[PDB]
Design an enzyme around this catalytic site. Structure first.
Site, PDB file in Angstrom:
ATOM      1  N   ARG A  93      -3.329  -9.701   5.609  1.00 14.52           N
ATOM      2  CA  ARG A  93      -3.660  -9.874   4.174  1.00 14.52           C
ATOM      3  C   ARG A  93      -2.462  -9.468   3.347  1.00 14.52           C
ATOM      4  NH1 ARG A  93      -6.123  -6.874   0.132  1.00 14.52           N
ATOM      5  NH2 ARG A  93      -7.511  -8.088  -1.260  1.00 14.52           N
ATOM      6  N   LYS A  99       0.829  -1.215   0.000  1.00 19.75           N
ATOM      7  CA  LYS A  99       0.000   0.000   0.000  1.00 19.75           C
ATOM      8  C   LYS A  99       0.863   1.265   0.000  1.00 19.75           C
ATOM      9  CE  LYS A  99      -4.585  -1.677   1.394  1.00 19.75           C
ATOM     10  NZ  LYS A  99      -5.424  -1.969   2.599  1.00 19.75           N
TER      11      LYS A  99
HETATM   12  N1  LIG Z   1     -10.227  -6.718   5.054  1.00 12.79           N
HETATM   13  C1  LIG Z   1      -9.541  -5.986   4.173  1.00 12.79           C
HETATM   14  N2  LIG Z   1      -9.806  -6.212   2.951  1.00 12.79           N
HETATM   15  C2  LIG Z   1      -9.172  -5.472   1.903  1.00 12.79           C
HETATM   16  C3  LIG Z   1      -8.265  -4.560   2.269  1.00 12.79           C
HETATM   17  C4  LIG Z   1      -7.989  -4.342   3.718  1.00 12.79           C
HETATM   18  O1  LIG Z   1      -7.156  -3.463   3.964  1.00 12.79           O
HETATM   19  N3  LIG Z   1      -8.617  -5.112   4.555  1.00 12.79           N
HETATM   20  N4  LIG Z   1      -7.539  -3.746   1.327  1.00 12.79           N
HETATM   21  C5  LIG Z   1      -7.769  -3.864   0.079  1.00 12.79           C
HETATM   22  C6  LIG Z   1      -6.962  -3.068  -0.918  1.00 12.79           C
HETATM   23  O2  LIG Z   1      -7.528  -3.062  -2.230  1.00 12.79           O
HETATM   24  C7  LIG Z   1      -8.722  -4.896  -0.393  1.00 12.79           C
HETATM   25  N5  LIG Z   1      -9.454  -5.685   0.634  1.00 12.79           N
HETATM   26  N1  LIG Z   2      -6.401   0.258  -2.315  1.00 14.39           N
HETATM   27  C1  LIG Z   2      -5.190  -0.320  -2.707  1.00 14.39           C
HETATM   28  C2  LIG Z   2      -4.197   0.426  -3.344  1.00 14.39           C
HETATM   29  C3  LIG Z   2      -3.013  -0.216  -3.714  1.00 14.39           C
HETATM   30  C4  LIG Z   2      -2.928  -1.595  -3.425  1.00 14.39           C
HETATM   31  S1  LIG Z   2      -1.509  -2.460  -3.866  1.00 14.39           S
HETATM   32  N2  LIG Z   2      -0.925  -2.764  -2.494  1.00 14.39           N
HETATM   33  O1  LIG Z   2      -1.881  -3.679  -4.794  1.00 14.39           O
HETATM   34  O2  LIG Z   2      -0.468  -1.618  -4.639  1.00 14.39           O
HETATM   35  C5  LIG Z   2      -3.887  -2.353  -2.767  1.00 14.39           C
HETATM   36  C6  LIG Z   2      -5.043  -1.694  -2.442  1.00 14.39           C
END
Ligand SMILES: Nc1nc2c(c(=O)[nH]1)N=C(CO)CN2
Ligand SMILES: Nc1ccc(S(N)(=O)=O)cc1
EC number: 2.5.1.15
Length: 282
Positions: free
Chosen positions: A255, A221
């Protein structure tokens, strides 16, 4: 602390690695479920072998600017995948969706957890969840997930997340979902700037006051990419550090995208916490 779903249990005595399996229209290509199914099952197999104990199956992207997916498109991709995995392996399967038909259709093919980043806010989602009797993950979010919009301002982000959780737990009980079926997730990256995200991680241990499992998702992220100033494919070390900090504070489910590496890191945390008079850092 254990979860019970589909005639099986998950022991939350140790950190679990939840691997990500995104089967969106842009990846589960060539249209309404191609031979992308072999791909999905193949990908799942690797994750399981690497040590994942849970697989998160999602048919909709929740990244900024992401398209909306129709119930049909979602149904077409998620169901077949959930079923093929349930039939073949012993892993726990969580379904990342916000649509009641997907919730309902998922329980029937063997899904164990309903992971709705929208916390069942869509019309009919609460009722569909209740009917299934499956565990539900509640996530904190300010705004629309897919907004290229800026992060809210918070009086105090931690107080706001706490109060949100109190309100959502309440909403669930009123609908028939026993508090003991919930998982809480602070929602890193959702309606949060860099500062807010590190404040939530610093104080993760304080969310145990609810006595519910904690699920977290920081993998690759923004909170990492911004801090180190690196692209998405160069975030493994940062990703690992966030998983360790969270686990060290007793998070129960992590996750991630890099299953092998996280599992190794979790093995080190487990060795450490077991030598720790009280099993958690604060
Ligand atoms: N429970 C949970 N689910 C997710 C999360 C997260 O941070 N927590 N982040 C995401 C990013 O696309 C997708 N799904
Ligand atoms: N919301 C979100 C933004 C970027 C990613 S990532 N970690 O695949 O770059 C996952 C969720």
């Amino acid at each position: 602390m254990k979860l019970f779903a589909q005639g099986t249990s998950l022991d939350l005595s140790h950190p679990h690695v939840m691997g990500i399996l995104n089967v969106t229209p842009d990846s589960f290509s060539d249209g309404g479920t191609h031979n992308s199914l072999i791909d999905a099952v193949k990908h799942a197999n690797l994750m399981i072998n690497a040590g994942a104990t849970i697989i998160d199956v999602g048919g909709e992207s929740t990244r900024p600017g992401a398209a909306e997916v129709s119930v049909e498109e979602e149904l077409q991709r998620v169901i077949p995948v959930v079923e093929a995995i349930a039939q073949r392996f012993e892993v726990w399967i969580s379904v990342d969706t916000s649509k009641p038909e997907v919730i309902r259709e998922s329980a029937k093919v063997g899904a164990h957890i309903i992971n709705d980043i929208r916390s069942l806010s869509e019309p009919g989602a609460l009722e569909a969840a209740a009917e299934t009797g499956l565990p539900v993950c509640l996530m904190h979010m300010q705004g629309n997930p897919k907004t290229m919009q800026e992060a809210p301002k918070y009086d105090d982000v931690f107080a706001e997340v706490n109060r949100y959780f109190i309100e959502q737990i309440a909403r669930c009980e009123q609908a028939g979902i026993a508090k003991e079926k919930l998982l809480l997730d602070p929602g890193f990256g959702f309606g949060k700037n860099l500062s807010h995200n590190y404040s939530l991680l610093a104080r993760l241990a304080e969310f145990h006051h609810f006595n519910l499992p904690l699920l977290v998702g920081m993998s690759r992220k923004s909170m990492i990419g911004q801090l180190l100033n690196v692209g998405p494919s160069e975030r493994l070390s940062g990703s690992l550090a966030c998983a360790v900090i969270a686990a060290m504070q007793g998070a129960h489910i992590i996750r991630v995208h890099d299953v092998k590496e996280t599992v190794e890191a979790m093995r080190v945390v487990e060795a450490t916490l077991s030598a720790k008079e009280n099993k958690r850092y604060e």
